[PDB]
Amino acid sequence: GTHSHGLFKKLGIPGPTPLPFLGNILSYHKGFCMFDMECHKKYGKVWGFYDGQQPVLAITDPDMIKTVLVKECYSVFTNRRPFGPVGFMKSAISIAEDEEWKRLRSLLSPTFTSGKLKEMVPIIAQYGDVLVRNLRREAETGKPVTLKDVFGAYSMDVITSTSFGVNIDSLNNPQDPFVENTKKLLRFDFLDPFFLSITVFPFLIPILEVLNICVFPREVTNFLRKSVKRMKESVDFLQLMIDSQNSHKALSDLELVAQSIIFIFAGYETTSSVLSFIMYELATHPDVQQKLQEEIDAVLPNKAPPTYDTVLQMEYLDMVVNETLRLFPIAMRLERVCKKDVEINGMFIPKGVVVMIPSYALHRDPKYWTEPEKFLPERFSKKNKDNIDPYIYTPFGSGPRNCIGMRFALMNMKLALIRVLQNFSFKPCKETQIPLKLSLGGLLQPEKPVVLKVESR
Amino acid sequence: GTHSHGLFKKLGIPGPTPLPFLGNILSYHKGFCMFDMECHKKYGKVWGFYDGQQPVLAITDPDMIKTVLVKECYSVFTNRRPFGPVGFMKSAISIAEDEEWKRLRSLLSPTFTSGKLKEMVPIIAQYGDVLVRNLRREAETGKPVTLKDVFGAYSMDVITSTSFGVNIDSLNNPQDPFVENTKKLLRFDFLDPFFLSITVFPFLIPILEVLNICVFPREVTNFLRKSVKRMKESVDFLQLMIDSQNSHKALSDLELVAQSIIFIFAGYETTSSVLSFIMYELATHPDVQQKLQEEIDAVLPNKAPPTYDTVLQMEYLDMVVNETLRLFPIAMRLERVCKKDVEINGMFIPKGVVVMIPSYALHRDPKYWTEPEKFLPERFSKKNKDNIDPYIYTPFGSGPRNCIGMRFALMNMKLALIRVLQNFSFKPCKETQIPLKLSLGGLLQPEKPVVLKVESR
Amino acid sequence: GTHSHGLFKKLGIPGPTPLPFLGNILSYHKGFCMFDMECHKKYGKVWGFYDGQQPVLAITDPDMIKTVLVKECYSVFTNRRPFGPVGFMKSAISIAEDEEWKRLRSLLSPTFTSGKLKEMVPIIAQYGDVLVRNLRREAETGKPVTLKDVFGAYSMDVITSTSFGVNIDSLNNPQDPFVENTKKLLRFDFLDPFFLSITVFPFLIPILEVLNICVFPREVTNFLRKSVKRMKESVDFLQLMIDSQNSHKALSDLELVAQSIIFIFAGYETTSSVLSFIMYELATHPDVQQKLQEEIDAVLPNKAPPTYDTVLQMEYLDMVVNETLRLFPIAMRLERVCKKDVEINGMFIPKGVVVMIPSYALHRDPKYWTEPEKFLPERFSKKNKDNIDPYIYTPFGSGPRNCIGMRFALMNMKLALIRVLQNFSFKPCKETQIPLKLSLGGLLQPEKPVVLKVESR
Amino acid sequence: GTHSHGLFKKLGIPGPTPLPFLGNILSYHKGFCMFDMECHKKYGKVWGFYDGQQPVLAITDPDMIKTVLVKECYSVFTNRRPFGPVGFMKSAISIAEDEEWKRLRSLLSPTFTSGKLKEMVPIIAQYGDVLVRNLRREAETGKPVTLKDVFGAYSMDVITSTSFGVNIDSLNNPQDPFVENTKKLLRFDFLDPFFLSITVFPFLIPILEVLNICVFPREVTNFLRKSVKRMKESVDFLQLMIDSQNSHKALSDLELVAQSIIFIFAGYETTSSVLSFIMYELATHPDVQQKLQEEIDAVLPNKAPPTYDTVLQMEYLDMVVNETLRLFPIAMRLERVCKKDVEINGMFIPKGVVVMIPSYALHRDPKYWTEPEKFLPERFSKKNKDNIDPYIYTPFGSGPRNCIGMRFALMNMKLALIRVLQNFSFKPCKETQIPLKLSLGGLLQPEKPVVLKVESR
Ligand code: HEM
Ligand code: HEM
Ligand code: HEM
Ligand code: HEM
Ligand SMILES: C/C(=C/COc1c2ccoc2cc2oc(=O)ccc12)CC[C@H](O)C(C)(C)O
Structure with a gap:
């Protein structure tokens, strides 16, 4: 039960010692974030562990990170860890591999340009107003607002109208067929029962793919696949893509x-x-x-x-x-x-290792950041926005395969905040978790949801 | 690829010839119902086929049916075909086996007595009125009603309030948390992609059970399991069961x-x-x-x-x-x-065969029924309700393991019809499928849903 | 990954704490024998552990052992742990279950009677002489004999001629087709790579059975199955069985x-x-x-x-x-x-637990045996052969499902020893492992094989 | 159950119609050779079928064959069909893929040069004499010789002494440890029970690889792996390789x-x-x-x-x-x-198709060969050795990935024949199968083994 559990002791790379079959996953009981800090502390700047039989080599040096993410991206480090079972979502840009991905990253890049984004701002701006009116209704009546719902509803109001042209007050219309499905589209908890079972028995993925089981639910996908058929057949992402096939x-x-x-x-x-x-x-x-x-x-x-x-x-x-x-x-x-x-940078890396950059931990490294637990927006001032290494601070990753939606994401979030701060101020409650605690799950998210008092200006 | 594909030729029992691995499932392309008639025609009164490697022995003689369903029920023929993956629903009375089932069939029988049913009629009757008011709203406005929704909503309005004490106008409140989940509780299509893949690779069931995949969705069950915890901790099925554990x-x-x-x-x-x-x-x-x-x-x-x-x-x-x-x-x-x-009745049946009584086909046998395609309610008159063999007409099965909910089901459906016929009359439409065609799927249900004109009396 | 890992803490039965998926198998690194003593020491007289997800309840009290092995044998404790993949060897008496086993234990008992054994002694005795002549050839020339080969050859010379009528000097004829196959028939190491992988993924057994993979090699079995066809079609086990089907x-x-x-x-x-x-x-x-x-x-x-x-x-x-x-x-x-x-004896045992009696450890319990590490044949004298509890000393097990071949095994071994001691004396060598060490594998057998000097009398 | 069973009807390529899951394998009941001729007859020069869900595109045009085997070999068509489970034999040159293979094909090519072969002839020649003396012993006594054993023994006598330096009269020493193992090294029958089960459930390969099951037996490989350790640590293939790692x-x-x-x-x-x-x-x-x-x-x-x-x-x-x-x-x-x-040559071939050249059938195409069923050595005379298209006659394949052992194979077989014909003449027997019939299995080999009379000159 120890295929390649000797690889890291052989290469002389340090790390925690694995159990058979499980590798190191018992150490994920405090989440990836907490696991990554400990290993950074213990073994220094490069270490290795096993997700099952899968060796993973962590790296925290910026010259070496750049070679992985930027330089040898097309040659050596093109794809993310095999992730399955996926069905037809193997064609999604973020799951596709090698040349299929290059084709798609090309075919979709002119959709995330500044020019196209600047044309999408009026759409995004309109569901700002929907958000505020969904917020004043929360703030007029004395009652602690739980952000995840008012904001979660907003991110939906935009995802829809920017990638399908559909205009929903998902908060106020929680039943439009469209709103149910697309709310089932949550990020994957890789420490939940299923995905941990995938890491121990990845030989079960082919079985699942054959049984037509999908991690992208087989019913959500069936609704959208035809809903676009009704859309196509009659300034947003869906339209800009329909164009990119009129070559x-x-x-x-x-x-x-x-x-x-x-x-x-x-x-x-x-x-x-x-x-x-x-x-x-x-x-x-x-x-x-x-x-x-x-x-x-x-x-x-x-x-x-x-x-x-x-x-x-x-x-x-x-x-x-x-x-x-x-x-x-x-x-x-x-x-x-x-x-x-x-x-790369004088370290041998064998074929088939997953190379991993531990963002969360590097962002909270005391060695690149003073008082790294403190909310201190001034480290990003024009004075200090220079002593910040772009391969240590990678909230969207770097390189040809970084977040294609970065400018959109940052413009989207900024309009929300602008309109919400214009009208309201946000004070804690007694029920506000202080200090905030992060869920020990596989998603970076607060243990207890964020609730705060909203007052009107 | 032919484990036990010789069993029926060995015993001298006739049948269609199997492909390797698939057995006879290619013959399900016209549904079980149509497959069963052909085999009744061809091979006479007893035949055998293979669901994958699983031999199934059909029987259509009433003395022999009685031995299976009634006499040797506790001794030989106690359980239905292994059905998985099931998770904790292995404790449901209809999936449990042998002594566990006997325990449960006992513990739950005094909940389906005439006395307890007669006490439930006022509850059931109230969502008759909800049904009619949900129907007059359909009938006032000139528009062909699609029965499956108005009736499907009614069966829900009763299931809830009779087994949890929850009173919903599910049609008019399609969003009460309760209504979403319990509408995901549909009968299983055993010719859909997944269940056919189970019949060919039943060696995959243990794998699925281990991966925590359930045929009873893992999210519907999570909602109800605690919702009952809130109910318990504060004249219906849930109450009558809570009693049966105050022994x-x-x-x-x-x-x-x-x-x-x-x-x-x-x-x-x-x-x-x-x-x-x-x-x-x-x-x-x-x-x-x-x-x-x-x-x-x-x-x-x-x-x-x-x-x-x-x-x-x-x-x-x-x-x-x-x-x-x-x-x-x-x-x-x-x-x-x-x-x-x-x-049984002079036929050897080896261990591990699934014995199957083809109801649909026997109910439409010309040899027990004249003009068997015709809607002729008079065959069930007190004059003729005697020349009807209860092991040929088994809409709820027979024996200790027949439909525990039969009197409920029949009383429930009868109240609906009574109140709906009192107030409305039902005339076809041009869009009414005539003749009705049955879905070739694995569920006995109309190809196209039933739509009819409703007029008020 | 912890299905039923709470069962023993729930029932209040003590034991070592399990890892997910692995249960306690990491503790088998010193063999079952050493694992069993530690648990006897630690947790007293009853404890529980997990082979994967499989709970196993150890018991060391003789009243309770008797109920398991003797009293409730037909009712509750009829079969040994599911063992697969087995193919047609599911018909072997020791793997068959419930009524199939009872049928076979009946059909084969009159083959292991004293009368039939007494008739087999002349056959067995003849390969005593073969053994001695294969030994004097070892003892004439000064050279340390490795027992496992001379004895292993003898057990073969008897197995063949007592269950097929075939008379081989397997040592001197190491190539007779028969001798190659039947020497591939070794007891199973349940801590070897494969069987440990079965305990962690017993959901893989159905897969293996379908792939026609067998633990009883698919080629050894093919040779014997027809070799008996040539035998049948033209005072030993094979004959006594051929008789028992002339009913x-x-x-x-x-x-x-x-x-x-x-x-x-x-x-x-x-x-x-x-x-x-x-x-x-x-x-x-x-x-x-x-x-x-x-x-x-x-x-x-x-x-x-x-x-x-x-x-x-x-x-x-x-x-x-x-x-x-x-x-x-x-x-x-x-x-x-x-x-x-x-x-049984005032302990609840849930359905599906494997109940296990740790023979090796009970045989070396200081609480029933003084100086239990010492070779002291006198504990079995007619004087002391009475203070020995037959549910503590169970080298062949007890009850209806004990070793059907016990009298044969004991008569077989005794004739060997008699003829070998008559002619030779056995003195250690320098290379003789002293003290003997037991293999930490899954078989009770010496780490290093036994080599001793043989001299002629 | 029909993933990509539409691919060939979509592309407009003709072929036989597939069953679900099985694809076309039911058509292998007459062997690949007979299946390939029929499809050549029916659908012309290009067709497609399915091994399970695996599409295979047959081609029989020599310009197009050359592009596959020769031109686009490094770019598109580098590897043979995934073949598993393989264990460490994934490092064998014939199973390795892409760059690993290129590395190995380089590292091993200077071992199959004419120069190195010419140095191996004396070794090979010596087991010619062993063959003849093993043949005169057959021919002196009046008895029909079964070639497969005398020749099978010869191919062994050479494989050993040319790739390990071990000199065995395997016929006369059928027990030297070496001879048993290496005789278990037979070519794989891809229509035998197991490999057909692999084609239907190739999702089971990862499972088998994890269970440490190997198609190259796990015991033969264990013997050789250390036997070379004894060889290394103390003019043949093993030596020439030991050299090629003294770079x-x-x-x-x-x-x-x-x-x-x-x-x-x-x-x-x-x-x-x-x-x-x-x-x-x-x-x-x-x-x-x-x-x-x-x-x-x-x-x-x-x-x-x-x-x-x-x-x-x-x-x-x-x-x-x-x-x-x-x-x-x-x-x-x-x-x-x-x-x-x-x-290639004006046909679109999608990623992941297995491209297949049906040698057996092309070699017996009446369109390139007159009287193609006849043994007519004159088609290969210097006069006609020119009208023969090297992409139609490919007994060793063509291109960078053809038979690395071709010159060896042809020199080896030619010396055998020379020495055997020098001394003996070969006349049929009555038991000689005439006409020869080919096994309908997955190996090209005679149904019944070849037996002939050998007389001495
Ligand atoms: C705060 C919001 C977001 C954050 C923090 C975020 C972050 C990330 C990160 C870290 C990656 C991995 C990049 C890498 O491997 O270097 C990624 C990939 C990606 N993100 Fe974002 N993202 C956000 C919003 C979005 C949005 C709005 C889109 C809309 C299109 C998007 C689309 C993608 C895609 C398609 C990829 C994969 C691209 C590829 O694999 O070529 N993300 N994102
Ligand atoms: C028109 C409505 C219904 C029909 C036609 C129907 C029919 C059937 C049939 C044919 C069976 C198989 C019996 C056998 O194997 O002989 C069955 C089993 C069963 N039905 Fe019904 N049923 C209906 C409504 C209900 C309702 C309302 C309940 C409510 C509790 C119910 C609960 C069950 C249970 C628990 C079983 C399995 C009992 C056991 O396995 O011991 N059914 N039903
Ligand atoms: C020193 C030699 C032997 C020893 C120590 C031995 C020991 C055992 C033990 C401990 C069991 C398990 C019994 C139980 O579960 O209580 C067993 C079962 C069995 N043994 Fe032996 N045995 C020996 C030789 C033989 C021989 C020569 C045969 C020849 C037929 C044999 C046939 C069997 C069979 C068939 C079973 C299973 C019976 C059943 O499951 O009903 N054994 N043996
Ligand atoms: C009559 C005897 C032989 C015949 C008919 C034969 C035929 C073939 C054929 C048709 C191939 C596939 C080539 C392709 O894909 O184009 C092949 C591959 C191969 N053969 Fe032979 N072969 C023979 C003897 C040998 C011998 C003696 C060796 C000794 C080293 C050998 C080693 C190989 C290897 C290593 C490959 C795969 C090479 C690679 O994949 O790069 N074969 N052979
Ligand atoms: C190496 C990884 C990168 C995450 O890249 C995304 C992110 C990151 C945040 O949101 C995303 C949405 C995305 O969507 C897409 O289609 C494609 C990528 C994507 C996996 C992260 C795992 O959770 C963990 C913690 C186990 O390593």
């Missing part, structure tokens, strides 16, 4: 449905979780919240509606976002499969 | 949740489908519908509300129900695992 | 081949291993060897050939055999599946 | 054991089967046998021993060998996995 080989039909779904998956709980973390930090730091409220009113006098250009104007906002993402990189880790034998 | 070993906690779930599963789409089939036949036979409307008004003058006793009074109603069930035994087949070697 | 249902054809194979498996390495252990103890205790040589010459003056009756006459011989089996019960454990819920 | 990365240790094993596998039953087929054809064509006997005596007057150079001198010999290989290409098919999307 690599143009995006097929099913290939298009796959991207739209993977966009929801990659965008829904990511955005919602970060918006929450930001409001938690503004609430538990009233000075920061006021300084930002003041910067918002300056650029936008008279509760003016935010634009693409006035969003890019506001620097304290940028610093708050970026500092929140430093504390809470909701990906936790970046990973690439090493598909040859290589020697 | 075999009293029903455990989880064992109770299992029964309530299996009741929904066994009762929801069964009832809805039969109510539809009955309305289809009343609509396409206006003479029968009028004769029954007339019998209803007699017993219940002035749109009087039906009672337990006036339901049992109405004989034409009984004949319509029973004749509909003859045409549409929504189970199609009865099955028992042969758990020893035996010789 | 429960008479033994089928394949059922007969299965028993003959399972006899080889159960008899080959068992006998060889015990004969070795006995010679080791005679060699490292020269007083015992001389006292037995002297008893042999008395009963059999002049190197007389042993008979059935003079074998039963020799009591010191009996004591040496029985005391060797106390130190080395080559089964180590006895096991029965608990197939209902029960309460 | 791509030099051949590792285990990588060397793997090649030696794969050499036995690729060389043992191949050579034996072809030598038989040649003797069958010489015996059933006495004119050819005499004309070759006469050519042998010319070049080698006085039963002179054959040399490397006099072997290359004899042209009728070449024609007999080459014409036998035309009738019996013991590979039957060549295959390459299509690892991108491509268009």
